Amino acid sequence: PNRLIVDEAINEDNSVVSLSQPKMDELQLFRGDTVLLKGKKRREAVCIVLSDDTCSDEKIRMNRVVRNNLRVRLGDVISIQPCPDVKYGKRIHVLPIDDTVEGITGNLFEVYLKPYFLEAYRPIRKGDIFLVRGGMRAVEFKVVETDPSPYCIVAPDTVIHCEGEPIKREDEEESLNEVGYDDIGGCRKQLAQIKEMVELPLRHPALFKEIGVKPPRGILLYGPPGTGKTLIARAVANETGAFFFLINGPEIMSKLAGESESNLRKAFEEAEKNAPAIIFIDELDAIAPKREKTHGEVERRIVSQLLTLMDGLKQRAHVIVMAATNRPNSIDPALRRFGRFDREVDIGIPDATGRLEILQIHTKNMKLADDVDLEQVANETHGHVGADLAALCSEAALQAIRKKMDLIDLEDETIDAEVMNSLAVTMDDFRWALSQSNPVPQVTWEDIGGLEDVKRELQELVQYPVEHPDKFLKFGMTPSKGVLFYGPPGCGKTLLAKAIANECQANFISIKGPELLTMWFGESEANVREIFDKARQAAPCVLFFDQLDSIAKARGGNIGDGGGAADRVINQILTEMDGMSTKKNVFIIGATNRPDIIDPAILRPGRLDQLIYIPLPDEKSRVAILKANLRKSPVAKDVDLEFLAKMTNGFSGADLTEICQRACKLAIRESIESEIRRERERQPVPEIRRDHFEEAMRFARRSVSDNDIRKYEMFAQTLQQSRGFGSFRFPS
Amino acid sequence: DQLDSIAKARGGNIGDGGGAADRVINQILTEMDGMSTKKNVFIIGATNRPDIIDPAIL
Amino acid sequence: DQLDSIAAADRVINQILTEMDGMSTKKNVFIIGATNRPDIIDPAIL
Ligand SMILES: Nc1ncnc2c1ncn2[C@@H]1O[C@H](COP(=O)(O)OP(=O)(O)O)[C@@H](O)[C@H]1O
Ligand SMILES: Nc1ncnc2c1ncn2[C@@H]1O[C@H](COP(=O)(O)OP(=O)(O)O)[C@@H](O)[C@H]1O
């Protein structure tokens, strides 16, 4: 019940807080009682509880000033408890801020403190902040000294003196703007994990004792630089009751030989002295590299001493040591073992919403106009780490100032107020920042013309499992992962593979047999294993094997001596695909120019079970191919693509692409003539002229003879005659 | 798996690494049955072409 | 130079084929091949 949501106070002063009647009853509390408030950044205060109906059950009506004292904002969670044994204060010493005391001709105590604390009966704590209105400037007071410590009620007979050294404005501001868990963005999950491995053992060590475990004494943070590991150290420093101490890797290296070890030993001694304690080690890889590869023996000494003191604690001191590294591999491998920095956390690059949060955090102090939208900037900056985002914000503010360099004058002793109030950041500044700062196939189904059945089948095999995983899990059948494309050359099999990869948004890897065949003994099979491993790394992926006939042949019969090695290659592929049954996301598509010699074992169901015959495009598909090729080129209306498709009976898709290439080349040539004519006029046709089609087609010939095509039909008819279960109906 | 690749009739392919395949076969022969105490190592082979496998392997 | 010395298809011509296919994306670099006799060079080059 102690948790409550920070809520505004309508009339309550700083030394009083308000609760709802049901909530105040729930705590077994009386009206006017002294209460203790705990808020973020380990900020503790004491106030007087009040009854109010407007105050919500889950909200506490409480002011701005104590919010600053508690370092909390609206909506923040603070823990409220009864405060017992709140003795009346004998004497309080308060240090006001430097800014507030300026211009106050009269004494602060007489003008402000004396009437404020007359019959106050207010309980206060060391470091408590309160505000008093009056004079030319409202005055802030901070209670540095309390007597008796720590909780003291200000009675009228209590003497109050503001004499001493007033608190500097920057010193109070730094604590006010000090970091907590909210200031770090994009790693809330990692903050929760770090709380679990670190904060949880410290708050409840007996809980770890009961279950028969020893808490992880040391934890490691690794990832790209700038992700905020030191910032996480700052946050855990501010918001943990456990005593926090600093060890800096550069600071460790700064000491003389034989003094870094002394500093670290006294560090662990101090940590084990206080109960509890947390140590953080930034740049652990800097002072703890591998002892196998080390330039100086002193570094080996410091690594060994760190190991010895790491084993020195016996899990009873309850001190957790934290380490941050940009390169975890540089850290000595011993530290990664058990009983020591075994627990690793990777602070990956922030996502879109995380980087949005980081941008908001970085820009909260800066002014933001109505036009600026941080979500857009986050959308464009895919890869910037948090430090890059901070630099982006700073250079956006720099553009804001730069746009006024014509208005402002540096030589002046003072700056203009008009330009200053006109000065702010706009969208253009963040655009410049985005431009300056530095952190799948193109082919689509619309590009392909014809072969609609093949397109639908490819969508069925690959796109549907990722679209509908639940349906596949329900029917309990693993999706097929094998497609073979066989047909005459230049019919868009590679286009089909690229299109399906683009539609499914998976990495596309394409390779051919001669790329793999090589000359050394085991090299080709190693290449096959490497390409399959590469497909695994880029999962989900579409692995495309072009010229499958060259790489896969009938093992039983091969004329050449080296064909035996070729046999070996095929075997490797077989085994690889047995490993590819595990990776359902990796989809293997094999296009072969001639499928008769393809090994029967590779076409076995479970490796390449789908066989697709890609024939020559018909008249309709030829029209579609001409449309696709002529999308980019404006064309005259006189040409009839239907007639072109009808005439080009023996041509493939590549033939038509070369056709359009030559046609538009002669279009360039007539453009040369037109521009020469324009130059003569100094001293145009919108679309392609028809005689260019006339001449361009003459250059083209038939790519593939019909005999190979009838061979393809013979293979397809063997496949069809094999599928002889058409006359199949279950009994009754 | 696919033992017929690593195991062949010795001398079948002259250009298979200059006898490196035959040396591999001899090494496998010594490692399966040689002058070492047999451990609890059960060797399973799978092949589609058993007639090409070395008779000493079988 | 002397592309005919290499020369229907083999490993090296396939490497160069894939490289020029990927290289067509970069228009700025200009690819020139001078061979003495073009009859024997692979038509995929053409
Ligand atoms: N998630 C985040 N939220 C807010 N600021 C961040 C975040 N990540 C990084 N930063 C900023 O970027 C900097 C990252 O530095 P850091 O990675 O801690 O240095 P090192 O790697 O040397 O310890 C910090 O100063 C911090 O202000
Ligand atoms: N249906 C089609 N639509 C558009 N272009 C096509 C089509 N079929 C083939 N092509 C053209 O043929 C050329 C080569 O095709 P390719 O992908 O090499 O076929 P294959 O997979 O048979 O080798 C491509 O540049 C492409 O422009």
Curated annotation (Swiss-Prot), chain A:
Binding site for ATP 2: G490, C491, G492, K493, T494, L495
Effect of L176W: In IBMPFD1; increased ATPase activity; impaired autophagic function
Places the protein is found: Cytoplasm, Cytosol; Endoplasmic reticulum; Nucleus; Cytoplasm, Stress granule
Phenotype when changing K293 to L/Q/R: Abolishes methylation by VCPKMT
UniProt PTM comment: Phosphorylated by tyrosine kinases in response to T-cell antigen receptor activation. Phosphorylated in mitotic cells. ISGylated.
Residue(s) carrying N6-acetyllysine: K471, K474, K637, K711
Alphabetically ordered keywords of this record: Acetylation, Amyotrophic lateral sclerosis, ATP-binding, Autophagy, Charcot-Marie-Tooth disease, Cytoplasm, Disease variant, DNA damage, DNA repair, Endoplasmic reticulum, Hydrolase, Isopeptide bond, Lipid-binding, Methylation, Neurodegeneration, Neuropathy, Nucleotide-binding, Nucleus, Phosphoprotein, Transport, Ubl conjugation, Ubl conjugation pathway
Main location: cytoplasm
Outcome, altering A138T: In IBMPFD1; uncertain significance
Family membership: Belongs to the AAA ATPase family.
Main function: Necessary for the fragmentation of Golgi stacks during mitosis and for their reassembly after mitosis. Involved in the formation of the transitional endoplasmic reticulum (tER). The transfer of membranes from the endoplasmic reticulum to the Golgi apparatus occurs via 50-70 nm transition vesicles which derive from part-rough, part-smooth transitional elements of the endoplasmic reticulum (tER). Vesicle budding from the tER is an ATP-dependent process.
Protein name, as recorded: Transitional endoplasmic reticulum ATPase
